[PDB]
Design a protein around this ligand. Structure first.
Ligand SMILES: *[C@@H]1O[C@H](CO)[C@@H](O)[C@H](O)[C@H]1NC(C)=O
Lengths: 193, 212, 217
């Protein structure tokens, strides 16, 4: 009951689509960061503002574990100062992001033959997301003067597009699970110290 | 409505600048993925640039740092600013909307980049030589700039058997074109053959008589 | 690294009512929503035919059907019609640029094999006065489009100083016509005697050479 429940986030059997990204608030526990990195089975483990190792002696008030699934090429978009569909309209890290981005290929978990249409991403949006904003709207996108009134058609599109993950895709198009750890500041989540 | 009307293309020297305008009606430019795609003479389609509804802009690798895409919200207009224009940028340029595949295109506008001055052609006779009884005769429309040049035969009276070829850009940067026509051999000694070349850009009309 | 679209064939011959398949291949397995099919007549802008690799764009005839997945996709025109003779492109929309097109496929009219008429044109005296000599070899009313023209100067196979161009398929006999210019300086032209062009085509059992000797009548 002391250790931070990082297995709940990382080892979970199903992840949210990037548009409806998941946030687990983490407070009052100790964070290993040895088990997390040193079991380096992750395709990406980048830490902005903090050394990845020599991190488990520092205390914070709470830490947020955001989790989702994107395609392989889109992992590089999960970083401060990036632009693109995922950064603009699904998940935007702040320009001064202090925390770690961890990502691993999940083709064996999230690709069905014939395509997995569960995982979606927001294709149409008028403005870019504010950092750490979550948009879960399904209202029809109005690309023209004529109002859509919730029907598809010309200038009227459904805002979310499915990844359709097939296991025969290029690795940049295979599913990739992503956990973004943000550290935020009486500090109570600490490392082993 | 629902069109995309372009303008701004023309003639510039290498290192010159243009600004292509693309006016839309039927949708909202700022609310769509708006893209620029070019096509060289005789070549295929190459994507050039894109502006997202949210603002992000992405460019083809061969235009980065020289092209900038923009939009005016009021006039509902997309823009492509082209600086340091290389000769390879010579193409028909189109603006298009991308909903799911590019569904609305524009009529296009022509961008020509060259260091050659406007020049009318010299018209030379491809006279009927030894060449069934079918003779070939034509005109070589050589060393003109810019495109194009129109060719008729016998003031338009002779149209059967005419083949006017697409121009070739030469190493000099000028264009050369051929207009041939096939006639019966017995016709060679009886009827006169004149080719008429109109080159509007340099404003030159040439009538050349072809005979063996 | 990037995705390369490759089309097959590059030229395609068929008749009205024929069934036509154009194939597009990707350098990587890609989502099928990525690619669209466009049609283009000469001197005109592309028209979107298909998107999401099978969805028929509104207003486009039913004879057009898209299919495929992974790395292979197909445009299929079920019953060819006169208005469907054009160039066709596939395109992948990558949701992160670049967007990439196929090389295109020109869909031409099938007719029976026809051999060309071959004519040699020596340089004009008017042009020779100006210090350049341009010989012109003409291939007339041939089919199919594929023909090889080889310039021969004193029986030397000439390369690099020639240029050619082809008319579109003729409106009433569906043939092609080709023109080739060999360009030389005046002095270089006067340094040789025999000027010839050699044509190889399907309708020609042997290559046909049309020649002349400079300064002869
Ligand atoms: C995930 O599960 C494996 C299998 O038991 C375990 O070895 C690993 O430590 C777990 N990771 C986390 C972060 O709990």
């Amino acid at each position: 009951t002391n250790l931070c429940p990082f297995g709940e986030v990382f080892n979970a059997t199903r992840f949210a689509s990037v548009y409806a990204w998941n946030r687990k608030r983490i407070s009052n526990c100790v964070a290993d960061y040895s088990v997390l990195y040193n079991s380096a089975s992750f395709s990406t483990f980048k830490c902005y503002g903090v050394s990845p190792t020599k991190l488990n002696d520092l205390c914070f008030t709470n830490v947020y574990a955001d989790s989702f699934v994107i395609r392989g090429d889109e992992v590089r978009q999960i970083a401060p100062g990036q632009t693109g569909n995922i950064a603009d309209y699904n998940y935007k890290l702040p320009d001064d992001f202090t925390g770690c981005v961890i990502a691993w290929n999940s083709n064996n978990l999230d690709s069905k033959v014939g395509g997995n249409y569960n995982y979606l991403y927001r294709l149409f949006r008028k403005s870019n997301l504010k950092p750490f904003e979550r948009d879960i709207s399904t209202e029809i996108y109005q690309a023209g003067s004529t109002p859509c009134n919730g029907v598809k058609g010309f200038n009227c599109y459904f805002p979310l597009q499915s990844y359709g993950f097939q296991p025969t895709y290029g690795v940049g198009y295979q599913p990739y699970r992503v956990v973004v750890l943000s550290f935020e500041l009486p500090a109570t989540v600490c490392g082993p110290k | 409505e629902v069109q995309l009307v372009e303008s701004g293309g023309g003639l510039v020297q290498p290192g010159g600048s243009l600004r292509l305008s693309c006016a839309a009606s039927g949708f909202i430019v700022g609310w769509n993925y708006m893209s620029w795609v070019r096509q060289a003479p005789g070549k295929g389609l190459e994507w050039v640039s894109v502006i997202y509804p949210g603002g992000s802009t992405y460019y083809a690798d061969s235009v980065k740092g020289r092209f900038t895409i923009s939009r005016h919200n009021s006039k509902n207009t997309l823009y492509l600013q082209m600086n340091s224009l290389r000769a390879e940028d010579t193409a028909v340029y189109y603006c298009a909307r991308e909903a799911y595949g590019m569904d609305v295109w524009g009529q296009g506008t022509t961008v020509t980049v060259s260091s050659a001055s406007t020049k009318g052609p010299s018209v030379f006779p491809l006279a009927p030589s030894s060449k069934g009884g079918t003779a070939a005769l034509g005109c070589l429309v050589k060393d003109y700039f810019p495109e194009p040049v129109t060719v008729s035969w016998n003031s338009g009276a002779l149209t059967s058997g005419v083949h006017t070829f697409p121009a070739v850009l030469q190493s000099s940067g000028l264009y050369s074109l051929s207009s041939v026509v096939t006639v019966p051999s017995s016709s060679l000694g009886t009827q006169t053959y004149i080719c008429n070349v109109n080159h509007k850009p340099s404003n030159t009309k040439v009538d050349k008589r072809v005979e063996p | 690294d990037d995705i390369v679209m490759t089309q097959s064939p590059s030229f395609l011959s068929a008749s009205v009512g024929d069934r036509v398949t154009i194939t597009c291949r990707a350098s990587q397995g890609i989502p099928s929503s990525y690619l669209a099919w466009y049609q283009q007549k000469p001197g005109k802008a592309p028209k979107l035919l298909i998107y999401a690799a099978s969805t028929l764009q509104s207003g486009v005839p039913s004879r057009f059907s898209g299919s495929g997945s992974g790395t292979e996709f197909t445009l299929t025109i079920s019953s060819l019609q006169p208005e469907d003779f054009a160039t066709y492109y596939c395109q992948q929309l990558n949701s992160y640029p670049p967007y990439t097109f196929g090389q295109g496929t020109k869909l031409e009219i099938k007719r029976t094999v026809a051999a060309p008429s071959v004519f040699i044109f020596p340089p004009s005296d008017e042009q020779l006065k100006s210090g350049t000599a341009s010989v012109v070899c003409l291939l007339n009313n041939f089919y199919p489009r594929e023909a090889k023209v080889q310039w021969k100067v004193d029986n030397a196979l000439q390369s690099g100083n020639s240029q050619e161009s082809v008319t579109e398929q003729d409106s009433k006999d569906s043939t092609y016509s080709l023109s080739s210019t060999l360009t030389l300086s005046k002095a270089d032209y006067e340094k040789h005697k025999v000027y010839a062009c050699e044509v190889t085509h399907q309708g020609l059992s042997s290559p046909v050479t049309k020649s002349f000797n400079r300064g002869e009548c």
